[PDB]
């Protein structure tokens, strides 16, 4: 049954794989990263600074220090959803890897816009814009199963040489899709020197 546009990958009679367009579409985080740039709504929850080395992963050390600080924020400064107060002492496997949670601005609705190499977080609080092109320094970014298993956390860097773990929640349709966006704009430019 060939006649429309001949060939097999353009005869409107095949499996999925978009086909109608050359790009692909994929989820909205990527389709917009290449387009004008996605834009969700995640409220910021202050910023915690660290004093440990950098360029490190550690599957156990990252969950102990990341959950430790993130615990003092969702607990000491209410704002999260399911971790305000419920007796959560537990030990604290950590010798020299942390800093202090800064709750100077707990609750600051900001639009998380992700463009091709332009993670700009508009400010929906006092009509401002948290960086119109946050995509050059930073240091570590994530927020899926581990870390918070619900919220998003990304340590940034630029004004100072101290990684600042950013804790944000209530993104509105993000978690996995948002992780795909930050990763997209992440590998856009960043002066790809390529070793």
């Amino acid at each position: 049954g060939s006649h429309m546009g001949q060939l097999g990958g353009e005869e409107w009679t095949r499996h999925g794989s978009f086909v109608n367009k050359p790009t692909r579409g994929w989820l909205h985080p990527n389709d917009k990263v290449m387009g004008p740039g996605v834009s969700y709504l995640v409220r910021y929850m202050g910023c915690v600074e660290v004093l440990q080395s950098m360029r490190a992963l550690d599957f156990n050390t990252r969950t102990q220090v990341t959950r430790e600080a993130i615990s003092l924020v969702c607990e000491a400064v209410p704002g999260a959803k399911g971790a305000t107060r419920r007796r959560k002492p537990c030990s604290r496997p950590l010798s020299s890897i942390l800093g202090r949670s800064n709750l100077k601005f707990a609750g600051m609705p900001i639009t998380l816009t992700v463009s091709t190499s332009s993670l700009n977080l508009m400010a929906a609080d006092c009509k401002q814009i948290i960086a119109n092109h946050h995509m050059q320094s930073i240091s570590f970014a994530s927020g899926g199963d581990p870390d918070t298993a619900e919220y998003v956390a990304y340590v940034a860097k630029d004004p100072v040489n101290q990684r600042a773990c950013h804790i944000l929640e209530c993104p509105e349709g993000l978690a996995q899709d948002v992780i795909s966006t930050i990763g997209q704009a992440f590998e856009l430019r960043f002066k790809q020197y390529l070793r």
Partner: peptide
């Protein structure tokens, strides 16, 4: 799901 850049975190 650990978003990392090739400038700060190098893995290759």
């Amino acid at each position: 799901h650990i978003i990392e850049n090739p400038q700060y975190f190098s893995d290759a």
